[PDB]
Design a protein around this ligand. Structure first.
Ligand code: 1VQ
Ligand code: ZN
Length: 256
Protein backbone atom coordinates (compact mmCIF):
# COMPACT_ATOMS: atom_id res chain seq x y z
CA UNK A 1 0.00 0.00 0.00
CA UNK A 2 2.83 2.39 0.82
CA UNK A 3 4.48 4.60 -1.73
CA UNK A 4 5.74 8.13 -2.31
CA UNK A 5 2.44 9.75 -3.31
CA UNK A 6 0.41 12.36 -1.45
CA UNK A 7 -1.81 9.71 0.05
CA UNK A 8 0.60 6.88 0.81
CA UNK A 9 3.94 8.69 1.16
CA UNK A 10 6.45 8.95 4.03
CA UNK A 11 4.12 10.89 6.34
CA UNK A 12 1.66 7.97 6.18
CA UNK A 13 4.05 5.07 6.72
CA UNK A 14 3.80 5.07 10.50
CA UNK A 15 0.21 3.77 10.37
CA UNK A 16 1.23 0.39 8.90
CA UNK A 17 4.83 0.55 10.26
CA UNK A 18 4.93 2.20 13.70
CA UNK A 19 8.70 1.84 13.81
CA UNK A 20 8.67 4.84 11.41
CA UNK A 21 8.73 7.02 14.54
CA UNK A 22 11.44 4.90 16.13
CA UNK A 23 14.68 5.75 17.88
CA UNK A 24 17.08 5.07 15.04
CA UNK A 25 15.33 5.93 11.79
CA UNK A 26 17.01 6.84 8.49
CA UNK A 27 17.80 8.90 6.60
CA UNK A 28 19.20 11.82 8.60
CA UNK A 29 20.73 15.18 7.98
CA UNK A 30 24.51 14.96 8.36
CA UNK A 31 25.63 18.07 10.21
CA UNK A 32 29.29 18.17 9.20
CA UNK A 33 30.36 20.44 12.01
CA UNK A 34 28.79 18.21 14.70
CA UNK A 35 29.97 14.83 13.36
CA UNK A 36 33.01 13.80 15.32
CA UNK A 37 36.21 12.44 13.87
CA UNK A 38 36.80 8.98 15.32
CA UNK A 39 40.53 8.11 14.93
CA UNK A 40 39.71 4.54 15.96
CA UNK A 41 37.57 3.90 12.85
CA UNK A 42 39.39 1.53 10.45
CA UNK A 43 39.74 2.22 6.74
CA UNK A 44 36.76 0.91 4.83
CA UNK A 45 37.42 -2.27 2.80
CA UNK A 46 35.35 -2.58 -0.39
CA UNK A 47 36.23 -5.80 -2.24
CA UNK A 48 34.09 -5.99 -5.35
CA UNK A 49 36.57 -7.62 -7.78
CA UNK A 50 34.55 -10.87 -7.80
CA UNK A 51 31.07 -9.34 -7.77
CA UNK A 52 28.52 -11.27 -9.84
CA UNK A 53 25.48 -9.29 -10.90
CA UNK A 54 22.47 -11.21 -12.11
CA UNK A 55 19.47 -9.11 -12.86
CA UNK A 56 17.87 -5.71 -12.70
CA UNK A 57 14.34 -5.26 -11.43
CA UNK A 58 11.77 -2.46 -11.24
CA UNK A 59 9.95 -3.22 -7.96
CA UNK A 60 7.52 -0.34 -8.10
CA UNK A 61 9.59 1.97 -5.91
CA UNK A 62 13.10 1.83 -7.42
CA UNK A 63 15.17 -0.41 -9.70
CA UNK A 64 17.40 -2.97 -8.06
CA UNK A 65 20.57 -4.45 -9.51
CA UNK A 66 20.83 -7.84 -7.73
CA UNK A 67 23.95 -9.89 -7.14
CA UNK A 68 24.64 -13.54 -6.42
CA UNK A 69 25.32 -13.52 -2.69
CA UNK A 70 25.56 -17.32 -2.23
CA UNK A 71 29.35 -17.05 -1.70
CA UNK A 72 31.71 -14.38 -0.38
CA UNK A 73 32.37 -12.59 -3.68
CA UNK A 74 31.64 -8.90 -3.09
CA UNK A 75 32.17 -7.86 0.51
CA UNK A 76 32.36 -4.77 2.66
CA UNK A 77 34.33 -4.86 5.91
CA UNK A 78 36.45 -2.58 8.05
CA UNK A 79 35.31 0.94 8.79
CA UNK A 80 32.91 0.76 11.77
CA UNK A 81 32.02 -2.83 10.96
CA UNK A 82 32.83 -5.99 12.85
CA UNK A 83 32.85 -8.96 10.53
CA UNK A 84 32.06 -9.31 6.85
CA UNK A 85 29.05 -8.02 4.99
CA UNK A 86 28.07 -9.42 1.61
CA UNK A 87 26.63 -7.33 -1.27
CA UNK A 88 23.11 -8.38 -2.21
CA UNK A 89 21.92 -5.46 -4.38
CA UNK A 90 22.15 -1.75 -5.07
CA UNK A 91 19.52 0.80 -6.04
CA UNK A 92 19.02 4.55 -6.14
CA UNK A 93 16.64 7.24 -4.88
CA UNK A 94 16.26 10.35 -7.05
CA UNK A 95 14.20 13.45 -7.59
CA UNK A 96 11.89 15.09 -10.12
CA UNK A 97 14.48 17.91 -10.33
CA UNK A 98 18.26 18.09 -9.85
CA UNK A 99 17.73 20.09 -6.64
CA UNK A 100 16.41 17.11 -4.69
CA UNK A 101 16.49 13.33 -4.69
CA UNK A 102 18.92 12.21 -2.00
CA UNK A 103 17.71 10.72 1.30
CA UNK A 104 20.62 11.77 3.50
CA UNK A 105 21.45 15.47 3.39
CA UNK A 106 24.75 17.23 4.24
CA UNK A 107 24.25 20.43 6.24
CA UNK A 108 20.69 20.32 4.80
CA UNK A 109 22.00 20.13 1.23
CA UNK A 110 20.02 17.68 -0.95
CA UNK A 111 21.85 15.93 -3.82
CA UNK A 112 20.22 14.93 -7.11
CA UNK A 113 20.23 11.26 -6.12
CA UNK A 114 21.70 8.70 -3.75
CA UNK A 115 23.04 5.22 -4.48
CA UNK A 116 22.63 2.51 -1.85
CA UNK A 117 24.84 -0.63 -1.99
CA UNK A 118 23.15 -3.03 0.45
CA UNK A 119 25.16 -5.69 2.30
CA UNK A 120 24.20 -8.25 4.95
CA UNK A 121 26.26 -9.55 7.88
CA UNK A 122 27.45 -13.06 7.04
CA UNK A 123 27.22 -14.15 10.68
CA UNK A 124 23.41 -14.27 10.20
CA UNK A 125 23.42 -16.72 7.29
CA UNK A 126 21.15 -14.78 4.98
CA UNK A 127 19.46 -11.50 4.30
CA UNK A 128 16.10 -12.43 5.80
CA UNK A 129 17.66 -13.27 9.18
CA UNK A 130 20.08 -10.33 9.05
CA UNK A 131 17.31 -7.71 8.85
CA UNK A 132 16.00 -8.89 12.21
CA UNK A 133 19.33 -7.93 13.86
CA UNK A 134 20.55 -4.51 15.00
CA UNK A 135 23.84 -5.02 13.11
CA UNK A 136 22.39 -7.10 10.31
CA UNK A 137 23.00 -4.79 7.38
CA UNK A 138 25.63 -2.31 6.17
CA UNK A 139 24.45 0.09 3.48
CA UNK A 140 27.06 2.17 1.63
CA UNK A 141 25.46 5.43 0.45
CA UNK A 142 26.99 7.53 -2.32
CA UNK A 143 25.62 10.91 -3.36
CA UNK A 144 25.11 11.80 -7.01
CA UNK A 145 25.40 15.33 -8.39
CA UNK A 146 24.70 16.34 -11.99
CA UNK A 147 27.75 17.34 -14.03
CA UNK A 148 29.98 15.07 -16.08
CA UNK A 149 28.69 11.63 -16.97
CA UNK A 150 29.70 8.57 -14.93
CA UNK A 151 30.95 6.08 -17.59
CA UNK A 152 30.43 3.17 -15.20
CA UNK A 153 26.74 3.96 -14.82
CA UNK A 154 25.86 3.90 -18.50
CA UNK A 155 25.18 0.18 -18.76
CA UNK A 156 22.53 0.66 -16.07
CA UNK A 157 21.01 3.68 -17.82
CA UNK A 158 20.80 1.80 -21.07
CA UNK A 159 18.90 -1.20 -19.71
CA UNK A 160 16.17 0.91 -18.04
CA UNK A 161 14.08 0.98 -21.24
CA UNK A 162 13.49 -2.75 -20.68
CA UNK A 163 12.17 -2.50 -17.12
CA UNK A 164 10.01 0.58 -17.44
CA UNK A 165 7.17 -0.62 -15.21
CA UNK A 166 6.61 -2.35 -11.88
CA UNK A 167 7.43 -6.05 -11.91
CA UNK A 168 9.59 -6.00 -15.03
CA UNK A 169 13.07 -7.52 -14.78
CA UNK A 170 15.97 -8.14 -17.15
CA UNK A 171 19.14 -10.18 -17.21
CA UNK A 172 22.00 -8.00 -16.01
CA UNK A 173 25.22 -9.90 -15.76
CA UNK A 174 28.83 -8.81 -15.53
CA UNK A 175 28.07 -5.31 -14.27
CA UNK A 176 31.00 -4.01 -12.18
CA UNK A 177 29.85 -1.93 -9.19
CA UNK A 178 33.41 -0.55 -8.75
CA UNK A 179 32.51 1.77 -11.62
CA UNK A 180 30.06 3.65 -9.36
CA UNK A 181 32.54 4.56 -6.58
CA UNK A 182 34.10 7.99 -6.09
CA UNK A 183 37.90 8.30 -5.63
CA UNK A 184 37.86 8.79 -1.88
CA UNK A 185 36.38 6.39 0.66
CA UNK A 186 36.19 9.02 3.48
CA UNK A 187 32.82 8.59 5.20
CA UNK A 188 30.32 9.41 7.96
CA UNK A 189 28.74 6.51 9.89
CA UNK A 190 25.78 6.13 12.27
CA UNK A 191 23.29 3.43 13.34
CA UNK A 192 20.01 3.58 11.45
CA UNK A 193 17.31 1.81 9.50
CA UNK A 194 16.01 0.74 6.14
CA UNK A 195 14.56 3.92 4.57
CA UNK A 196 11.50 2.23 3.07
CA UNK A 197 8.91 0.07 4.85
CA UNK A 198 9.36 -2.19 6.86
CA UNK A 199 11.83 0.48 8.12
CA UNK A 200 13.67 -2.12 10.24
CA UNK A 201 16.40 -0.69 12.53
CA UNK A 202 19.08 -3.08 11.34
CA UNK A 203 21.44 -0.83 9.36
CA UNK A 204 24.91 0.50 9.98
CA UNK A 205 24.97 3.43 7.56
CA UNK A 206 28.26 4.33 5.88
CA UNK A 207 27.81 7.47 3.76
CA UNK A 208 30.70 8.63 1.56
CA UNK A 209 31.72 12.26 1.70
CA UNK A 210 32.64 12.44 -1.99
CA UNK A 211 29.73 12.39 -4.42
CA UNK A 212 30.01 10.94 -7.89
CA UNK A 213 28.99 13.05 -10.89
CA UNK A 214 26.43 11.79 -13.42
CA UNK A 215 25.14 13.60 -16.51
CA UNK A 216 21.79 15.31 -16.83
CA UNK A 217 21.00 12.71 -19.55
CA UNK A 218 21.78 9.83 -17.21
CA UNK A 219 19.52 11.03 -14.36
CA UNK A 220 16.91 12.08 -16.91
CA UNK A 221 16.57 8.42 -17.91
CA UNK A 222 15.93 7.43 -14.26
CA UNK A 223 12.99 9.82 -14.33
CA UNK A 224 11.36 8.03 -17.29
CA UNK A 225 10.79 4.89 -15.24
CA UNK A 226 7.26 4.18 -13.91
CA UNK A 227 5.96 3.38 -10.38
CA UNK A 228 2.92 1.75 -12.00
CA UNK A 229 2.71 -1.61 -13.70
CA UNK A 230 2.24 -2.05 -17.43
CA UNK A 231 -1.27 -1.21 -18.58
CA UNK A 232 -1.91 1.19 -15.68
CA UNK A 233 -2.01 5.02 -15.80
CA UNK A 234 1.54 6.29 -16.00
CA UNK A 235 3.00 7.83 -12.88
CA UNK A 236 6.67 8.68 -13.35
CA UNK A 237 9.11 7.15 -10.84
CA UNK A 238 10.55 10.36 -9.32
CA UNK A 239 11.02 11.63 -5.77
CA UNK A 240 11.23 8.10 -4.33
CA UNK A 241 13.17 9.41 -1.33
CA UNK A 242 12.25 9.60 2.35
CA UNK A 243 13.08 12.95 4.01
CA UNK A 244 15.53 13.30 6.89
CA UNK A 245 14.35 11.87 10.24
CA UNK A 246 15.09 12.97 13.86
CA UNK A 247 18.64 12.11 14.91
CA UNK A 248 17.43 11.55 18.46
CA UNK A 249 19.99 9.82 20.62
CA UNK A 250 22.72 9.25 18.03
CA UNK A 251 26.16 10.60 17.11
CA UNK A 252 27.39 10.59 13.52
CA UNK A 253 31.11 9.73 13.37
CA UNK A 254 33.50 10.81 10.61
CA UNK A 255 36.42 8.70 9.34
CA UNK A 256 38.27 11.87 8.48
C1 1VQ B 1 13.00 -2.71 2.27
C2 1VQ B 1 14.25 -3.26 1.72
N1 1VQ B 1 14.75 -4.43 2.07
C3 1VQ B 1 15.91 -4.56 1.40
C4 1VQ B 1 16.13 -3.45 0.63
N2 1VQ B 1 17.19 -3.24 -0.27
O1 1VQ B 1 18.07 -4.09 -0.32
O2 1VQ B 1 17.15 -2.29 -1.05
N3 1VQ B 1 15.06 -2.60 0.84
C5 1VQ B 1 14.81 -1.27 0.27
C6 1VQ B 1 15.19 -0.15 1.17
O3 1VQ B 1 16.63 -0.24 1.39
S1 1VQ B 1 17.43 1.02 1.88
N4 1VQ B 1 16.84 2.31 1.15
O4 1VQ B 1 17.14 1.14 3.28
O5 1VQ B 1 18.78 0.83 1.46
ZN1 ZN C 1 17.80 2.96 -0.50
Amino acid sequence: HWGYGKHNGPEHWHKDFPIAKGERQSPVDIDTHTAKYDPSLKPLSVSYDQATSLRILNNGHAFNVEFDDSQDKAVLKGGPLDGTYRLIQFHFHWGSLDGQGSEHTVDKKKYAAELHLVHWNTKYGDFGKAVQQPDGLAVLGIFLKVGSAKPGLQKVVDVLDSIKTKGKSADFTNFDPRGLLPESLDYWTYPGSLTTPPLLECVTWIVLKEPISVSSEQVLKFRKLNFNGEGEPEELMVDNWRPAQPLKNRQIKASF
